[PDB]
Each structure stands twice: as C-alpha cells, then as structure tokens.
Design a protein that fits this description.
Four copies of one chain form a homotetramer. By secondary structure, chain A is mainly alpha-helical. Chain A has helices at 5-10, 39-44, 49-58, 64-76, 85-95, 100-108, 118-132, 136-145, 167-177, 182-195, 205-219, 225-234, 236-259; strands spanning 3-4, 14-15, 20-22, 25-26, 33-34, 37-38, 271-273. Bound molecules: acetyl coenzyme *A (3 copies) and oxaloacetate ion (2 copies). Chains A, B, D: Homotetramer.
C-alpha cells in the first residue's frame, strides 16, 4: 500500500509546492479572516461595505472617511437608467428568461473602454498630467494638440451654474473630509479652463471619482505612492464602477422579471441591411 | 530535506487522489488524441468538424452521414440576423468596443429557454410523446389540453408551397441518408395534424433538427438507447445550437468592428418609465 | 472688439512690457486718487510725490482734457489737495456726455520745452498698422493725417529699425533721432505683442535724461484675452465718460466670455421703461433704431443681444439679470419688455424661450406688481414651441404677454408696445449646383440641413463630401438624402479628406475662435479650396488680418468670421443659413430668384430672405459677411460679383454703423462700374441719438469717425443713387417698388413655380407634435436618468444622500422600489459584508483567480467566477429561504418538517456546518442572528428555523443553521415583516431571486479582491498538473 | 387618434434613422441569406463550415481550399486536454452543476493574451516583420534585443524527428493547396534560425495557423491587402481559436455531466496563504 499523500504531508515527509497564493481572506480556522482581521472584529470596529472593501481589495484598514467615500462612490455609480449598454444587455437577457447571474454577466461584459471605463481613464490621465509637473493650461493644450478629449470632462446637459448634484455631493464630502486633495485641485483648475471654453465642460462623476480616489489612495496614510500607483494601474477604479453598477443591473433584472416582460426582438425598421449583392 | 512529491510519485511511494476525470482528449503523449483517436488518424479518415464533434462530444466514431448531418445542422444554425436577442447583445458589446470573447459571450448568455432552447425543447417533447406510445393526434390533444404549445411547430410566414427552405434541405438529407427515422415520421404526422389546423403550424428548423438529432443518436449504431437519452438530457442539442450560432455571433462582432460603429445608447422614446411617485 | 483702457492701465503695461534701449523714465511712477482713497496711505506708498512736483488730470476716458480745464500742472501736493475737491466728485460735461469725477491720476511734473513735444500714434487698419509721428506734437499738433509722418507696417511684416529714420523721422532732431527710433521700435513691439489696436502717445517728451510718456490713449482688442492673459493680468475696460458700470453688465460680460455664444448687455437708462431681449446684433440694432424712431430714446433702458445659439441656462441667466434690473424702480406708465429677434438660422428658439419663461416664472411677482407688458416676435428653429410656451406662461403667471411669429414684420411689436399701432485670383461664381464642401467639426444638424436643402433643390449629389474632426478616428456618419440613407466620411485630418475628395472646392469651418485661425491657415495650403466660410465669433483682429492677407495671396474667398454663411437658392447653402427646411420652403429658397443681397448679420440675412421672398421674385444669392471689424470679404467684393453675375437683376445691401465701406459702393456707382439697381440700408441710426459711445454686438459696429455713422452712410448712398428707404420699415416697400418697376420693363421674367421634392418629416418632430404613435419596447421602474436629477425609484439622489441611507437603502430602492427602514438597510449591508468572501478554494474564486492569472481582465475574471454561482455553489441562500418558507407556510411543525425532508431523500438547505457546531458557533451566524433578534420586530420564520436547528442538533452537533440558512430565513422575515412589502410582493421577490442577487453582489467584492490580489502578486498562467487528472479515454473511438 | 408609426413609415411620411447596421445575414425575406448568398445555394455549392464561415466573417466566397483549410484549423484547435485554463474553468463550472452556456462561457472568458491569443500574436508579429522588409535573421536579432519571445515559436517536447503532427498536417495542406505562401516561407526561415539555436523552438501550431491564415487572406483573390490587414487587426484569428476551442469546451462540459462529477473545491494544501498580520 502506497503512502497517503495527506498523511505524508502531516509528518512533513514530502514536499508539494502550492500552485496558488492568496492574501485577502482566510477561511480555514475557527474564525473567518478578512486580510488579517477577524469578521467579528470587522463588525465591532463598525466598518461597512467600505471597510470590508478596503480590507479585501487593498489589505488595509482604511480610515472612516475613506470607507464612507468608497460607499458613496458605490451609491452614485449604482445605476444610470436602462438605456446604457450594460443595462440594455442585462434587460435583454432577463427578457430572454435566462437567469440573474447570466443577465448580470451579460450586462457586465459591456463594461470597458467605451462604457464604464471613464473612471479609470480619467484617473490615469489626470495622474499622468499631475505627475509630469505640467500646469493645467499646458495639460489642456497638450490634450487638444494630441487630438484627445480629456477623460472625465464634459456633460450632456449640466454645466456651470447647473451643477451635476452627484459631483457636488462627492466633492463636498471630499473637501470636508479628505486631508489633502492635490489631484482634485489640479482637476478643478482643468475644469475651470475647460468651462471657460464652453459651459458644459465640467468635471464628470467619472472624473470626480477618479481624481478623488487617486487622492484618497495617495493621501490617506495606508498606502505608499508605489502602492497607490499599482492599484490604479491594475484597476481598482474599474472594480469600483463594476461593483456599483452590478447593483443597478441586478435591480434591472428583478424589475424585468417582476414586470414579466416577454422575449425582445429588435425591430427590422431599426436595422440597416447593407449586405453585398452576391458573395 | 523533505522528499520531493513528484519524485516520490515516480517511485510510487505516495498516493494522491486525482481530483479531475476526463475522457474526451489526451493532450499528453507524443500525439494529440481525440477520444482514443490520434489527430493524424482523425485527418486520415477524412472526417471533418462533424467527426471531430462526434469524437469530442460522444466519444464515438460516427458514420459519415451522421458527421455530415451534424455539419449541416451547424451550417443552418450559423446565423439568423441581428434582430434576435443574442445577436443584439453581441452587437451592443462590440459597439461598446469591448472584445471578441466578451462580445460573443454577452450574446451567448441569452441562449436558454426563450431564445435558442427550442432545439432541445422540441427534441424532449417529441421523444416523450413517441416513447409514451400515444398517437400523434392524442399528442396534439394532450398538448392542447395541458396549455402548452408544441415546441418545434409553427412558422411566421412560410407555411406550404413555400417551406422553410432550411427544413427542406435537412429533411431531404435525413430521408436520403438516415437508415430509420421513427421520431421524424412521428413529428411529420404531428405536423400534418397541426397544418390541418392552420397552415403555418409546420415543423420548424428547431423541431426538425431536434427530432432528426434524436433519430441519428438512437438509430445510428454508435449509441444505445440509454446513451442517446442521456445525451439528449444533458444537452447535446443545446451544444449544437450554441456552437452553430457562435459562428454568426463572431461574424456580427467582426461586422460591427469593420463598420466602426460607435457606442449604442437606447433611445428614451422607446422606454416607458413607470417609477413610483416617491419611495 | 477694441476696448479703450484707462491711462493708468496703459502706462502700467507700457512700463512693464516695453523693451527699448532708450532709458524710459518715471517707470511705474504715478499716483491714482479716488474719492474712496486715503491720502496718508498714498503718501506713504508713493514717496516721490514729495520728491518732485506734480501734474494731475482725470483718468475716466475723457479726451481734450487740456482745453476743458480738467488738468492741473506745476502744482505741489498741497496744490493737488486744493485742486481736486473743487473738481473731484463733481459734475463735468464733455460733449453730449456728463458724469462724475471718480478717478484722477497724479504723475511727476516733467520739465520740458516746446521743442521736445512729440506725437507717436500706432493704429490698426485692414492692410496693416499705421505709425504716425509728429515733431511738433502736443497742443499745437493740429492736423495729424496731413502733417505727421506716416508709415504703414503690413500684416506679418516687421518694423525694422531702419526705414524709421527714413520715413518717420525726417523732421526729428538729429541728436535724438537714434534713441527716438529705438523707442518707436520698442513701442511697435509693445503694440503688436499685447494686441493693441490703438496706441497714441501725445505728448511724447525725450530729454537728455530719457523718454517720457506724458499721456497715452490706448484701445485693446478685448477678444485677444485668451492670448494675452498673463500679460494683461486683470485688465479693466472703463466705460465711456457719462456711463457708470454695473455689476449686471460685468456678470453678462463674464457669461459672454465663458462661451462661444454672444451675450451683450449695456445699461443706458436704468430709469427707462423699455427693455429689450433681442437675438442677434443686427436685430438688436434695428430694434433700437425703431425704438428711437418713435421717440422712445429717452425711455430706452438697455441695449442687449444674445446670439450664437445660447443654451437654455445661459438664456435663463441673461433673462433673469434683465428681469431683476427691470424690477428695481417703479414707473407710473408701466414697463415694456421687447423680446424680439429676426428669424433665427440656428438658435434654438425652443430652448432660449424655455430659459426666458423660466426666468419669467421666477420673477412673476415683481413683474406683475411692476405692470410689465411683454411683446414677443420671433422665428427660427422650433419657434412654434417657444411661442406656445411663452403664451402659456402669459396666462399661468398673469403677465400680459403678446407673442407673434414670422407673419409680423418684426419692426411692429415696437409700434404696438410704444402705443403707435394697434395690437393684432478670386472667382465670380463661388457656388453652383456641383459645389462640394468639407465641413470642419461635428455639426451633424448643420450637415443634415445642408443635405435637406440640396434634396429640395433637386441637386444630383449632396453638397457635403466629407467631414473633418480631429478628436476621432476616420469613420462614416449616417445621413438622410431625402428618405434614402447615405454615409458621409469623417476624417481625423485635413490631408486625408482633400486626398480622397479632390472635387471639394469649399471649406465650412465650424472651429471655435481658438481653432479657426489654425484650421483656416492649414486649409489655405490646399489649392483645391477656393472658398472658406468661417463661422467662429471672437477671433482677434490681428489673426483675422493674417487670414485675410494669406487668402488674398492665395486667391481664396473667405466668408468673414462671425457669419452664418450664405445661401444660393437651387445650388448651395453654407451651414445653418436660412434655418431649417420649413423656413427654406417658406422663403422659397429652393429655387433661384433675381435679387442678390449682402448683409453683415446672419439673422438679418434671414429677415432679408423672408422680405425678398415676400416682395420680389426671390433670392438669387445671399451672403452674410459677418460682424467682425475686418471681414474676410467686404461689401464691394460681393457687389462686384453680383454686378458681374448675369442672373442677378437687383442688389440689396444691408450695411451697418462704422467703417467706410458703403462709400466704396458709392464710388463704384459714380465711376459706372455698378449699373444694376442697388437698394441699401445702413442700420445703426440710434447711435446719433444716444448721448454716449455704446458698443453694439458686432465687433465692427463702431463709428470711429463722423463719416462712419449710419446716418452719414445712408445719406451718401442716397446722393450716390442707391434706393435708400426712410427706415428698415420701408425696406420691404422700396425693394418691392424696385422689383415692380424692373419687371414692367421686361428686365425680370419670373419663372414657373415648380413644386420642390418632398422630404419626410423627422420622427422626433412628429413625436413632439404628437402626430404619430410608436409603442415603447422597454419598461423600467427602478431608475430615471433623464431630467435634472438622477432618481432612484422615485426618490432623488440628493434626497438619497440627505436621508443618510447607504448601500442598503440604495439596494432597497433599486431592487424593491421601497424605502426600507434603517434596520432593514443595515441588515442588508451586514449580509453583503458576511457573504463578501470565503477564500480562494471555492469554485467561483478559483475560476476568477484562473482568469486573472490568464492575464485577462477584471470584468472577464469576475464574470468567469460569477458564472459558477448556481445550485451547487452560491444557491443555498435562496434554496434555504424557499425550503423554510414552504415548510412554515404548510403549517407543519418543525419535527414534521425534519421527518418529511428525511423521508423525501432531501437534506435541509441551510443546515449543517463543517467544524463549528456548538460552544463554538459560526461567528457569522451569531453576528447576524444577534442583529436580527435585537432589531427585527418579528421573526416567525427565524424562530421556526431555530426550532428545526434544535432537532437537527439533537441528531448531530454540526447540523446547525448555516450562514446561508440564517440569511435566507432572516431575509424572508425582513421582507414579510417590515411594513414595506405585502405577502404577495415578498413571495414574488423570493421567487424571482433577490437572495441570489444578495449572494452575487456580496461575493463580487471578494472576487474583485481576488482578481486584484492575483494581479498584485503577478501570478503567471496556471496549468492544472497532469497528476491531478485521471484520463479515462476509450481504447479507440 | 395619432397615426401609427408603422403606417406612417409605410406611407413614407416620416424619417427615422436606423440605429444598427449589418452586412452578414438577411433573416427577413422568403429565404435566409448569408452575405448576399441564399442558404439553398449555400448548400448547393457544397461548401460546409469553412464556406459558411467565410461568408459570415468576411462576406466573401472563398475558394474551396481556403474553406477546407479553415475547417482544418478549427479541427486542430478543437481541444488540448483539460489542464489548460479555459478547459479547467469550464470543468469547474460544469461540476458546479451550472449550465452548458454558463460553463462554456466561463471557459471562454480565459481566452486572451496568455491563453489562446498566440494565434493572433504570431500573425501580427510575423506580418510586421515581413512587411518591414527585414530578413529573418534581422527579425530574430531584433526580437532578441527587445527581450521578446517570438510568438508562434517553441514547443514543449516535440522538436525534430518527432514534429507536432498538427503543424505537419496543416503545413502539408498549405504547401499542396495554397497558391503562394510568402509569410509562411518567412516564418519557416525564422524557424530554421531558431532551431539552429536549440531544437525545441519550432513553428508552433499557433504560429503556423497565424502565418498560414495571413497567407490565405492576402494570397487568395477574395481580399485586398487593406482588407486582410483589417481582418487580422480586428481579430479573425482570435475568432478562429475561440470557435475551434468551443467544441472542446462543450465536450468537456458534456463529459463532466456524463461522469456526474460533484462540486469541486481546491485543496487548502495547494494554496499559500500570505495574509498580513493584522490589517
Ligand atoms: C461616467 C460619466 O460621468 S461621463 C463618462 C464619459 N466621460 C468623459 O468625460 C468622456 C469625455 N467627454 C466627452 O467625450 C463628452 O464631453 C461627453 C460625451 C461626456 C459629453 O456628452 P455630449 O456629447 O455633450 O452629450 P451626449 O452625447 O451625452 O448626449 C447626446 C444628445 O442626445 C440626447 N440623449 C442622450 N441620451 C439619450 C437617449 N437615450 N435617447 C434620446 N436622446 C438622448 C441628449 O439630450 C444630448 O443632447 P445635447 O447633448 O445636445 O443636449
Ligand atoms: C498556443 C501555442 O501553440 S504555444 C503559444 C505560442 N507562444 C509562443 O510560442 C511564444 C514563445 N514560446 C514560448 O513561450 C515557449 O516556447 C512555450 C511556452 C510555447 C514552450 O514552453 P516550454 O517550457 O518549452 O514547454 P511548456 O512550458 O509548455 O511545458 C514544460 C514541461 O512541462 C510539462 N507539462 C506541460 N503541461 C503540464 C501539466 N499540466 N502538468 C504537468 N506537466 C506539464 C511538459 O511535458 C514539458 O515537459 P519537459 O519538462 O519534458 O519539457
Ligand atoms: C453557503 C453555506 O452556508 S453552505 C451551503 C448550505 N447548504 C446546506 O446546508 C445543504 C445541507 N448541508 C450539507 O450538505 C452539509 O451539511 C455541508 C456541505 C454544509 C457540510 O458538509 P461537511 O461534510 O460537514 O463538510 P464539507 O463537505 O464542507 O467538508 C468536510 C471536510 O473537508 C475539509 N475541507 C473543506 N474545504 C477544504 C479544502 N479547500 N481543502 C481541503 N480540505 C477541505 C474540512 O476540513 C472538513 O474536514 P473535517 O470534517 O474533518 O473537519
Ligand atoms: O430561426 C427562427 O425562425 C427563430 C429565431 O429567430 C432564432 O431563435 O434564431
Ligand atoms: O460560506 C460557506 O460556508 C460555504 C462556501 O464556501 C461558499 O459558498 O462561499
């Protein structure tokens, strides 16, 4: 009878390398641990979604204002109606009678450059401009001469004297709670220049969240500059938008299943057919 | 120094249970093997996609007519235009500039009961009717009194003197090549009864493919009745539709990328907003 | 627009920025005294006041100060002290203007002789900058244009130090020729790099010590603010003497500078009872002339205009500013608000009138108590909706509002408001039917209007061949050719567009003022483009002169900036000219006529379109050359074209105040070059009746001399033989009389009226009119993105945050459309917190980690993990809730439920743990259970599940309530025991999968954390080891 | 009563732009049309999966050898065992009892740069080298000096005297049937240089398929150079790999459901836990 692998490991007789590494959650043991913190201690220390997210995404005990800011970001990105690409896809999959997971996933797969990536894009653009040391006017001119529109700038209806009211809540929280907001100040200077061009070139929710998240990361004491830069590069802000919008997509799925909408077919009048004469 | 796991396994001193089982493909070894059959021999037997699918899905060497019929089924399910739910979702995800895999997956997640499940549904319905021993008229009456529509029956415009033209090719192939078609004959009797009701209640491409696939499975010598029943139960026909329509979904993605279509946002005039007064 | 700056500001800029080898004296050595200044403070911040003698003169843009006794010389500190108060803060009358003395300047006295009184002036012209120098300057300068040395410096030409001693310094003293020339060169550099348009130093004194600038009058191109921002700093533009500045004027000026639209407001008489809301500079000018033609000049309160398609918000801000200004004092006779305008070309009348009516609703109180009567005349895009909403506000507020449309002559609401009428080389042919244009910028509405015009004109091909937009990649844009759908290419670069479309001969530049110069300069590098239309307003005059010089060199016709463009009925239309297709059909601009016109204004050009269509055969060609000081092409440039064009039979010129341009037409008629009948009216006659120097909306609308007044121009044209109406009222009649007398002689043979091709109505317009019915394909009840504020299930987002709900409250709103209690929202949050992650070994976390190590993506990795959420993994929440709800609703006791599940071969969902049984519980079940038992009002299903747990643990210890079981039963309890849901609603939510949603949303946090962890650790591609896979392939299939 | 939108469109009284464009399939009409070509004629010309794929992906009537080569590419990319990332994910999702679509989709979402993207990577890399005009030795040295491995080069065990036997089949077909193989000849020259280094750097199946697909696109008469370049840029080879491996992923799902494997949990001994001491 051959030696039992588990019982050989128990005596430490053999060496089998572990193929996986994790640092965010320990399920083994008498107590569940979130990045070194017991779940009961998680609940006595009175964090919520923001604190749990800080533990699970950054392995940090964020300050209460940081945790609350993360919560508000999730609340403001929760939904933006059924007409966007992801909500449209989720509704189509729900009306196909498919599944909650399948419908939400179908909607989420649209999250990318054109839809839902402006948070990360604005964060990266403003961070690069701030770190290069160029002044906001030079940054605006450089984007204009490079044929690029500033990510996180520009609104559809709302302008100066017609505040977004989602940007205002987050901005007011950031000014009254964050210790320092250098990148937010830089982005506000850029916004002043762009609104001097045409009124609706205001800081978006995407731009506000991106710059405020970068400011939180590199101005709260939990992260070094390298850590904050790495998290921005690997996509913590993409994760923020995805987690926020999943709430709205699940709401849309539940809405369609309660309304008991049937299978959707796109009308032919809305499709232009440009097939070749004969291939 | 503790003993090496791999080298202790080579000496056969320890026992570690394998957590996975597979029977369709052997990647290791001098030659790639598809269900016991070398890849060079796969190409020497001049089989194609249908034969490779037979190997990889059923671990069987199907006859040439069976493999050719599988190929024709994939050919006829390849696409049905951009208005269906899956193609719509794929096009939305492509116009969001996302990715080929993400776009195709977004479209594929709609494949289920209401869209793309009629193949399996019709196969199961007709198999159950044929196995229960009831005549086609009794089957029609039982479905009528149970408040269920016969899946795989009923077209939109093409009824008679103008058939599906996709049902016709497949039915002609099955007639000329399949040895016996008991469930197909049963489905055709059901179709005669339903067309005696109103002309457009004809055997759909979904119904024809489902009944002909059950016929191929349980009338070619490769499978026993239990095996054919198990394959129908676990979803070989869902697999057939998914694989066939993947070709069309990828074509739709490539078409949108070539046409360079921008981000789609659903018009507000097409959405009815029925939010509550204040919640 | 050239704005005069104060002497202090000009001297400060000169001292700060001039670069001369000459030792400029008294640098930053001047004193400003005002009534609100402290003399001790000035004495201790400017000590030279005691060091030398003084000179004092006001700095309120008063000229001729020497001979009106406003300047005091050779008087000390005590002298200026005794000298100011008898004049400081007093009343002075210069010309027709009178005003206070709130600003004075004190400078050192310069001891100088009459032999060193020099005059140096630099002023801008179309062909360049003229530099005048006089050796006998000062008071005795006399005539300057005939006795002072003149020297033109052309556009893009440097004023070299030589040729100044040759042309400008013939009579200069030899001992001071060199330093004088150096100073003049430095002064020209100062003039050119700070975008001065006028710079007169009189007198200039140069002693052995150095050069003294005793005085200077300077006008600066205010539109160049975006260029000279750091050099000007906070440059201020004083109002003309006799006018006091107002915060409302400053607010409107800031609003105007903040956008590409035009917003002008000038307060002439705050006590006046006539107020105007006129769209368009030319329309505002003609309304002003009409008001002062009926004797309302004394009661005219403001001159104002809004142009450039202002937004709803901008129009609201403008309207509310004027409404607040109108509701300050009270007039016994009441007050009048003239909301006028021409027929707009592209200004959204609906949006602008929505802004105005919002302001009217906001001020309906003071407006009603002020007896304000509103007269409205307007036409343009969507004017029916705007007239409708203003009429509605007129009754929903009580304000007497009389709205009229195009059928009114637009100089009629003035008559019925003031109580006078009852209230009811360069080519000749720029465009043809084969003209192809390239549009710079995304102007899809403008391009579509162009295509609609081409279709109703029976053109073979669309007039727009390509579009250029540098902020996107090359693609094809979808447009309408009648009812057919066509694709128009869009290019990132000019070069690609001109490469692929060599047949294009016209550019329509929709670039802003900051991009128009560069785009036009780049455009004139292609010889195929023969006409460029520049739409942007606010381009600096120096840049426009550069464009003019290059276009003249290249033989390219430029339809000057700040123009709507032009229209040639039957052949071609520039941009938004002529408005939308309904106006094109109303003015019959799809077919040629015989009257060609040139105008400065665009809206006035649409008015001309309407008038000519009504009174004559029609329009052959109409060009608006723009309101800028230097148009790309002038009046004569187009009148010559029309005279040389055989299809036109009479010419209509709509001139303006300022610029001796109509005198060229007079000379052309005198020399016999112009022979066809010409009908001209020059607008701006009210400036002669205004006791001030008000600047109109147009940049060029400024009478610099006495011959550039509109009255003088109209008189000169009348003596030249041009048919000149008595006013803009009689323009239609004189055009009609000329057309009739030209028809009766057989000169004009009107053609048959062939009906135009029909264009289908737009779907959006038909929906707005409620003409058609299209069922909505989608239904939503959870979020309303449209509107001013985002709404989550009927409750605004600001209210969401003010009520202090968090994720739990937002989730209640978005998932159930209920305002859940605080404990319910908090419990939802804790459920999400406890389902957040359970390590990397579960199926979903494993799949997510695999996809992350495949280097894939956050969304793809999370989605790969989420697709495992189902029956075997992640579905125990819903399964336990459904099982326990069914058992509890069946009425069977927990023991019966346990026996039943045992006899059906089913394990109880949500029962059974791995290690933690009793005396050591889950520590997650405990937290949630303690919260539920402390905050939930009633927990019947939780009590039932606890009884079931008591039996299962009577069987074996680890059969305890799981986190899944406890969350399921507690969620059902919350749904059906908080007051928000009925039993049917709670059952439906449980059936459709709210608990599946809870688990999915909770575990998404852990899956994203796992993805980020793998990316931080930089784990490579995973491959499952072969020793862990059992291969059971058949022997040979 | 307002006019019906469909009635107003039929009368041509209103204009509503179509928000979607398609050029690959016409579902409306008496017959289904694949890129301008009727389905009955599709089956009459005796093309199969390869011809249908040519129609749906490129809107071209490819030559018979091109269609057959596309079929062989799909056949050789069908499966490579259960150990790869996508098959592993599919097997996990199937053992979670989930669904065919969900399981296949879970496996497919791994298709990207590290897994399954070598086809497109090799095609793009060799195309750039061939178009730049540098000789194979210069290309090899250039990739060496930029510290990049040549995509499509390098095998695990099979180098010479025992080649891949999939590369051999595809290469023999390409040599016998393709009119010209310039990029293939270039890649074989590169492979000779790399095998002069040590034998195991041979032309991979990924490299062979990439270069042979580029050769087919730009050497069959159906495409111009711009068209072939655009198709390679937008991801026809990614589509080829995805469609080929979907058959293997569905086979793996069906295999797991036939073997009735339970829920998988990764062993704790294979995971290294590196959580922080206390966050
Ligand atoms: C997530 C965020 O907060 S923003 C995300 C993007 N972030 C960026 O900053 C991207 C960079 N910035 C930009 O490119 C631009 O400034 C934009 C796109 C953000 C600004 O958008 P705009 O082009 O001004 O307007 P948008 O394209 O959203 O709206 C199109 C028009 O159709 C209308 N419209 C919008 N959605 C719909 C709909 N579903 N149905 C019908 N009409 C609609 C709107 O009224 C709008 O009209 P208007 O803009 O002329 O008033
Ligand atoms: C898609 C394709 O065709 S390959 C991708 C193409 N990309 C490129 O070609 C880019 C450049 N090429 C490369 O990166 C490299 O040449 C590779 C990765 C393709 C070749 O890698 P190699 O290190 O030569 O082989 P690989 O990493 O696949 O396998 C290494 C060894 O592990 C063994 N092995 C492979 N998979 C497993 C498994 N699941 N369990 C246990 N052992 C395994 C192999 O037998 C091989 O054995 P050896 O030690 O006797 O050589
Ligand atoms: C979401 C939830 O709350 S769980 C789902 C709830 N659903 C139900 O309640 C359904 C009914 N209940 C049941 O089916 C059962 O009671 C279960 C599955 C919940 C409990 O099953 P058990 O057999 O007690 O434990 P489980 O199957 O989890 O694993 C048992 C052993 O595997 C070991 N194990 C678990 N995970 C791993 C891993 N990743 N690696 C190695 N070993 C492991 C444990 O150490 C345990 O050993 P022990 O029993 O000697 O301590
Ligand atoms: O094929 C049909 O007729 C039904 C259909 O649109 C699809 O599900 O593909
Ligand atoms: O939470 C548990 O105990 C069971 C588990 O692993 C999961 O589904 O996440």
């Amino acid at each position: 009878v051959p030696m039992d692998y588990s019982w050989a490991r128990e005596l430490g007789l053999i060496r089998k390398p572990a193929s996986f590494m994790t640092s965010i959650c320990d399920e083994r043991g008498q107590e569940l641990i979130y990045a070194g913190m017991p779940i009961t201690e998680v609940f006595k220390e009175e964090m919520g979604i923001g604190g749990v997210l800080g533990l699970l995404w950054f392995q940090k005990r964020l300050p209460k204002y940081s945790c609350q800011f993360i919560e508000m970001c999730l609340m403001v990105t929760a939904d933006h109606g059924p007409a966007v690409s992801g909500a449209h896809n989720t509704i189509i999959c729900a009306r196909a009678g498919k599944d909650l997971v399948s419908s939400l996933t179908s909607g989420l797969l649209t999250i990318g450059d054109r839809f839902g990536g402006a948070l990360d894009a604005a964060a990266k653009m403003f961070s690069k401009a701030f770190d290069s040391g160029i002044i906001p006017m030079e940054f605006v001119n450089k984007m204009k001469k490079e044929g690029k529109l500033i990510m996180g700038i520009g609104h559809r209806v709302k302008s100066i004297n017609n505040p977004d009211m989602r940007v205002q809540i987050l901005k007011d929280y950031v000014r009254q709670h964050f210790p320092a907001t250098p990148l937010l100040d830089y982005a506000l200077e850029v916004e002043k220049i762009t609104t001097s061009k045409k009124p609706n070139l205001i800081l978006n929710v995407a731009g506000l969240i991106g710059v405020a998240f970068v400011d939180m990361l590199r101005n709260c004491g939990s992260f070094t500059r390298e850590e904050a830069d790495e998290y921005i590069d690997i996509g913590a802000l993409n994760g923020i938008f995805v987690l926020g919008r999943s709430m709205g997509f699940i709401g849309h799925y539940l809405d369609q299943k309660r309304l008991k909408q049937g299978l959707y077919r796109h009308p032919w009048d809305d499709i232009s057919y440009v097939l070749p004469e004969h291939m």
